[PDB]
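Supplementary material to the annual report.
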Amino acid sequence: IVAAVSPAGGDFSDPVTTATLGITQVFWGLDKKLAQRKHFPSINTSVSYSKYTNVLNKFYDSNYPEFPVLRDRMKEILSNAEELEQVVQLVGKSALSDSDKITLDVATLIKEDFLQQNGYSTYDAFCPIWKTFDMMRAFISYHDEAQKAVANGANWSKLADSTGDVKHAVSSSKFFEPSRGEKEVHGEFEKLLSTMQERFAESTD
Amino acid sequence: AEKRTLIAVIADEDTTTGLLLAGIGQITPETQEKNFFVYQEGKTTKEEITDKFNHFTEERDDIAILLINQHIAENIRARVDSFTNAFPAILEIPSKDHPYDPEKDSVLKRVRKLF
Amino acid sequence: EQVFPTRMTLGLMKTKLKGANQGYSLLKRKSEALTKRFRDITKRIDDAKQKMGRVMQTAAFSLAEVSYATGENIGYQVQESVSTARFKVRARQENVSGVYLSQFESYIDPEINDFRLTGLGRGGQQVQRAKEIYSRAVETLVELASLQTAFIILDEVIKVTNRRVNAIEHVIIPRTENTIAYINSELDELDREEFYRLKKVQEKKQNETAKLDAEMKL
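Predicted assembly:
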């Protein structure tokens, strides 16, 4: 079954939602803000859950043994974003460290080029599982590389300019049409990751 | 602003000569304007001081720091007190021929409250 | 104490109250962080003010006793000879507490100060003696202005932040609290009426069934 509830104003106080939340195993809450900005699909990652995330590892490990840790890393990055949101809005981004602005600008990148999707197109109407895994790995790797670059010592304000196109490539990674096949996308992702690693290696000098 | 490079001096010759000797100033032939308005005791009025203060502060973006004698500032003391901006870094320099008092400073007036 | 709503937007006001409280808590300490440096630089400027007021006079005396060793005027040639600048300044940046502060760096250029003013034969050596005294004095004087700039900027920033904190404390929190109390009262006001309606329905039903059963006994 896949039900659907209509939030009659408060999307948590109506008795229907309260009754359903006690017996359902998954929940995809609705947030007014992502709808108001016209951000589709608009589902709230702060209040939602999927109890099946445990029993799925038997399939994952036999298929994609890295998927869970990548998911955990992405979730914690996202959470840190909104955690810093209150302070950065009430004061203004003027004292943030160099390892934190990386988190801000990676959370925005993810929120704009991973969780954003439009089914009224051809390249992205049904994203397969391997494509999602590849995109997810690429984003995590980019974040880790930026953090490493600042750790070794370099002002990120100029490191962003020095890197440049490697930030755009991932943002365009969502255009590898599945129709191309399954290996002809895997090769593209491999070369993208290698190019990213080399660019980060050579830009520290 | 990075144009805050030149230094303004409105002081008696006994100090201006030495200041230029230290190499702080020069001649600006583009306007034939010195980095200072030389001062003559008992020969220079007070309106000239006000005009040069305004010229150095609100007409010249070159000046970063202004040095003025206590007695010269006394002629524009009201003008100096009224004007309070961070750009010119106004400084009441000690004056030759007078034992300078480090308590006539317009800047120090605000220091004199809320210790 | 605003344009009173009455809906179930209580959670919205509750979240706004937490946001305001967090902002107040953070700003009340960001104020003190800068107040520390304000206190420091106040003394740093005040103590050195008179020290400089006296050392500058000492240097002026040192050159004054030099100006007539050659027994002739030097100023007339000085005020025209000077055409190169060395003791200029540069804008140094230092965010003490996330606040911009364009400081002054003494851009000392000890390669030329004034060309062709020594070696006339009577006073070239004498002027070379007290000149470096002023070269040091001007570098020392740069820092006093560097501190005054920071003083003014810090005063401005502390003033604005303290004003904002006072405003938030005094004319924001109580308004939201009054609004929350009003909405809380309204909710119970509606609950009472719903309860009364249900009570009336139950009374009617029990009276009707009592009539019916008391009739059916015969």
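The longest strand of chain A covers residues 26-28.
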